[PDB]
Design an enzyme around this catalytic site. Structure first.
Site, PDB file in Angstrom:
ATOM      1  N   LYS A 122       7.872   0.987   0.429  1.00  0.00           N
ATOM      2  CA  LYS A 122       8.093   0.411  -0.555  1.00  0.00           C
ATOM      3  C   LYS A 122       9.546   1.031  -1.414  1.00  0.00           C
ATOM      4  CE  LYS A 122       4.566   0.949  -2.955  1.00  0.00           C
ATOM      5  NZ  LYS A 122       3.838   1.340  -2.201  1.00  0.00           N
ATOM      6  N   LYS A 145       4.213   8.299  -8.289  1.00  0.00           N
ATOM      7  CA  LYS A 145       4.711   9.383  -7.452  1.00  0.00           C
ATOM      8  C   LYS A 145       6.135   9.568  -7.887  1.00  0.00           C
ATOM      9  CE  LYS A 145       5.274  10.246  -2.394  1.00  0.00           C
ATOM     10  NZ  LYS A 145       6.881   9.667  -2.076  1.00  0.00           N
ATOM     11  N   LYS A 194       0.654  -1.255   0.017  1.00  0.00           N
ATOM     12  CA  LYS A 194       0.053  -0.039  -0.062  1.00  0.00           C
ATOM     13  C   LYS A 194       0.810   1.318   0.061  1.00  0.00           C
ATOM     14  CE  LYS A 194      -2.142   1.855   3.409  1.00  0.00           C
ATOM     15  NZ  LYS A 194      -1.361   3.015   3.754  1.00  0.00           N
ATOM     16  N   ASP A 218      -2.096  -0.286  -4.069  1.00  0.00           N
ATOM     17  CA  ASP A 218      -3.397   0.049  -3.574  1.00  0.00           C
ATOM     18  C   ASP A 218      -4.541  -0.346  -4.492  1.00  0.00           C
ATOM     19  OD1 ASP A 218      -2.385   1.931  -1.253  1.00  0.00           O
ATOM     20  OD2 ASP A 218      -1.501   2.617  -3.330  1.00  0.00           O
TER      21      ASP A 218
HETATM   22  N1  ADP Z   1      11.849   1.711   8.633  1.00  0.00           N
HETATM   23  C1  ADP Z   1      11.555   3.035   8.501  1.00  0.00           C
HETATM   24  N2  ADP Z   1      12.284   3.743   9.409  1.00  0.00           N
HETATM   25  C2  ADP Z   1      11.652   5.113   9.395  1.00  0.00           C
HETATM   26  N3  ADP Z   1      11.153   5.500   8.554  1.00  0.00           N
HETATM   27  C3  ADP Z   1      10.778   5.192   7.356  1.00  0.00           C
HETATM   28  C4  ADP Z   1      11.055   3.371   7.238  1.00  0.00           C
HETATM   29  N4  ADP Z   1      10.513   3.084   6.058  1.00  0.00           N
HETATM   30  C5  ADP Z   1       9.965   4.110   5.699  1.00  0.00           C
HETATM   31  N5  ADP Z   1       9.993   5.323   6.027  1.00  0.00           N
HETATM   32  C6  ADP Z   1       9.594   6.501   5.979  1.00  0.00           C
HETATM   33  O1  ADP Z   1       8.319   6.339   5.591  1.00  0.00           O
HETATM   34  C7  ADP Z   1       7.823   7.203   4.325  1.00  0.00           C
HETATM   35  C8  ADP Z   1       7.286   6.459   3.381  1.00  0.00           C
HETATM   36  O2  ADP Z   1       8.056   5.379   2.679  1.00  0.00           O
HETATM   37  P1  ADP Z   1       8.133   5.167   1.094  1.00  0.00           P
HETATM   38  O3  ADP Z   1       9.008   4.315   0.830  1.00  0.00           O
HETATM   39  O4  ADP Z   1       8.116   6.325   0.409  1.00  0.00           O
HETATM   40  O5  ADP Z   1       6.626   4.494   0.899  1.00  0.00           O
HETATM   41  P2  ADP Z   1       5.947   4.133  -0.229  1.00  0.00           P
HETATM   42  O6  ADP Z   1       7.010   3.928  -1.477  1.00  0.00           O
HETATM   43  O7  ADP Z   1       5.572   2.641  -0.215  1.00  0.00           O
HETATM   44  O8  ADP Z   1       4.828   4.958  -0.879  1.00  0.00           O
HETATM   45  C9  ADP Z   1       9.065   7.824   3.885  1.00  0.00           C
HETATM   46  O9  ADP Z   1       9.390   9.276   4.184  1.00  0.00           O
HETATM   47  C10 ADP Z   1      10.120   7.158   4.407  1.00  0.00           C
HETATM   48  O10 ADP Z   1      11.358   7.755   4.817  1.00  0.00           O
HETATM   49 MG    MG Z   2       7.521   4.762  -3.323  1.00  0.00          MG
END
Ligand code: ADP
Ligand code: MG
Ligand code: ADP
Ligand code: SF4
Ligand code: SF4
Ligand code: MG
EC number: 1.18.6.1
Lengths: 272, 272
Positions: free
Chosen positions: B15, B41, B10, B129
């Site tokens: 990811k 994104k 999600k 999603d």
């Molecule tokens: N293990 C973690 N510890 C701290 N922050 C995290 C961790 N994993 C993700 N984040 C933070 O969560 C937010 C969303 O992560 P992201 O990888 O961009 O999600 P997605 O790609 O699934 O939309 C980002 O700001 C990222 O830095």
């Molecule tokens: Mg992403």
């Protein structure tokens, strides 16, 4: 008259909890309301109906032969406060467009005359992680006149708010779809209210209410109830009553001004 | 040989942070890797490239005339550890299918021969999603042989994992797309590792690693870096190294057994 409102936002942000509690507060005031679930998760009406979920229009049409074999009185179900409820449904994952059921459901409701003069509000609960197919239909086809976006200080939630706002702008030349406000559904982070107020100001809207994080929500939902019904004395019930009052009284409906990724990152850097 | 892996989950679950850090750890071991961003994104490669984001195939094709005017050497960009990076892009919100750019990008990479024998891994970072259009293409069209789902004890994250699993089952009769494991990206909640282990067991897979919540991630990402590059001594860097090692060594690839909503709610009730 009847006001047609749609609640958009990223997955898991609180759309269905916020919508059902807001609508329960409206019914508690005496308003007649219908909720139309437009998210394939199809749990957007369960707290009004006290139910596991609700059988969807897509499902019922298949069991009955065609959508024409369905009557409105067979599909709409009433729960708490007389609130009327329907779920669109959608195809299984990997099969066809996840939003296809929204198109079928809204067309069915319009044709069968679900929009009786005595309804005061219709709320659509819409998946907002992508703005396309049936999920864009309420905007493209002028069904959701007033959009409220549930969000939080989460980057992804704010990005989704900006993306939904871009969809509203894309269709500004036809219809009357407008952004009515942001609803902050708290992550218990500091200055989170100020962050969402700032984002709203940059978009040209307002943050209509700040909904606190409160465990009473989970206790109500374990029992398939809104907080309004489960514990009408709860502070969180009064929060939803305040949100409902402010939606009723809201007069600001705008074509939003989407922001750049640089502006969005600058927002988080400042308040963080 | 080369292993084709896709990371689903999600929105906002982690990811892109998990994929880029995992891939940086692989490059640190000496593996040759390409990342293909399949989320509109379009920030799935920024931590490898030290960049704001990356210009997308959809954008570059439009500026150049047609996708045929693009060469692979013009589109692929190398960053940390020689990791090669590309972003699909997608149409603006409200316009066309949000996944349409994934189809264009993957077909372009295949035709231009991006899949040289000397790559060891390709990672697709895919919005999860909804499982439809271009987002279902890596499963439907046999591109993502090994799927890893990033999730957490969040109901919505677990629901998404179940939905992606249903998509894998739908296409089990063709191709070789399989579920390789769940990756728990922690919310700092108790027994969260046990919850995701239980969900994995019910699906028939495993939880390949538990990634802790660690503020060093934000400090690295403010500087457009993976933790692997930003602070190679960090405990969190070793967590990503452990995840990468376990992906390399993983031999369990299954057709998952999706669960009912009742089973999913029972899981949360027990561990909560
Ligand atoms: N293990 C973690 N510890 C701290 N922050 C995290 C961790 N994993 C993700 N984040 C933070 O969560 C937010 C969303 O992560 P992201 O990888 O961009 O999600 P997605 O790609 O699934 O939309 C980002 O700001 C990222 O830095
Ligand atoms: Mg992403
Ligand atoms: N203000 C709140 N306080 C506590 N829990 C909340 C609050 N808002 C939402 N939740 C919980 O968050 C989860 C996701 O909410 P939901 O409305 O189902 O999201 P969506 O419909 O946007 O996917 C639910 O378990 C819900 O009970
Ligand atoms: S994104 Fe779902 S079908 Fe176009
Ligand atoms: S969901 Fe996006 S276009 Fe079908
Ligand atoms: Mg919902």
């Amino acid at each position: 008259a009847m006001r047609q409102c749609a609640i958009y936002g990223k997955g898991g942000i609180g759309k269905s909890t916020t919508t059902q509690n807001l609508v329960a507060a409206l019914a508690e005031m005496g308003k007649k309301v219908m909720i139309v679930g437009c998210d394939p998760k199809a749990d957007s009406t369960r707290l009004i109906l006290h139910s596991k979920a609700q059988n969807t229009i897509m499902e019922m049409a298949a069991e009955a032969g065609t959508v024409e074999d369905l009557e409105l009185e067979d599909v709409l179900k009433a729960g708490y406060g007389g609130v009327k409820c329907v779920e669109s449904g959608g195809p299984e994952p990997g099969v066809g467009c996840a939003g296809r059921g929204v198109i079928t459901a809204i067309n069915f409701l319009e044709e069968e005359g679900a929009y009786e003069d005595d309804l005061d509000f219709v709320f659509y609960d819409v998946l907002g992680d992508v703005v396309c197919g049936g999920f864009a239909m309420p905007i493209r086809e002028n069904k959701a006149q007033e959009i409220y976006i549930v969000c939080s200080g989460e980057m992804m939630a704010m990005y989704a708010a900006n993306n939904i706002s871009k969809g509203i702008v894309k269709y500004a030349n036809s219809g009357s779809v407008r952004l009515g406000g942001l609803i902050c559904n708290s992550r218990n982070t500091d200055r989170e209210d100020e962050l969402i107020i700032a984002l709203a100001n940059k978009l040209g809207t307002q943050m209509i209410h700040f909904v606190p994080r409160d465990n009473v929500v989970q206790r109500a939902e374990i029992r398939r109830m809104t907080v309004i019904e489960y514990d009408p004395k709860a502070k969180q019930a009064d929060e939803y009553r305040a949100l409902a009052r402010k939606v009723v009284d809201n007069k600001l409906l705008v074509i939003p001004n989407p922001i750049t990724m640089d502006e969005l990152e600058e927002l988080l850097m400042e308040f963080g």
